[PDB]
Amino acid sequence: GMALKRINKELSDLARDPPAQCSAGPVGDDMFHWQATIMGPNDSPYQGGVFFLTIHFPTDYPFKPPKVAFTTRIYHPNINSNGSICLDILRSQWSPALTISKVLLSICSLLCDPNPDDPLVPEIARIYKTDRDKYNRISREWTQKYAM
Structure with missing residues (x-):
């Protein structure tokens, strides 16, 4: 029951001092x-x-x-x-x-400052390292398509 108690404490703190943009919490009975x-x-x-x-x-x-x-x-x-x-x-x-x-x-800091030297997607690391404007354009293209 230790885990459930810490999960409830983090929810309480977050609720009482809400971030202005991000959010997190339970979406059902399963905490x-x-x-x-x-x-x-x-x-x-x-x-x-x-x-x-x-x-x-x-x-x-x-x-x-x-x-x-x-x-x-x-x-x-x-x-x-x-x-x-x-x-x-x-x-x-x-x-x-x-x-x-x-x-x-x-x-969020990861999004603003990627770590191309330890990548999960080698091709994207390549583009990030060699052509930042292209990386930015494609990143923006996918944001518009999938995240808006």
Whole structure:
């Protein structure tokens, strides 16, 4: 019952100090499944887009990281077509000091500053590294098609 209690605490804190753009919480009786939304960051190719994510807390959260994946298609070196995310805090650098909130904001920093040297989609990493304007254009094209 430890996991459920921490999931309720994060929901309380989030509800009481709401972010202005992103959001997350339960969408049903099952507290271990959350939906989250982030806005494509202003000043990025993702601007105006709304990206949905699905979160599954494990039964020994917060000592193991939540499973977080996009359900909205997105063009990015570190996010693949199944929506899996390469972000170290979701893997090796997870800590119980971290929260869904800081995970979302971190994903936003990832969107604004990709890590092409550790990619999930090699072709997108290539384009990001060699032609940023093209990368930005395609990123914007996919935002308009899939996230708006």
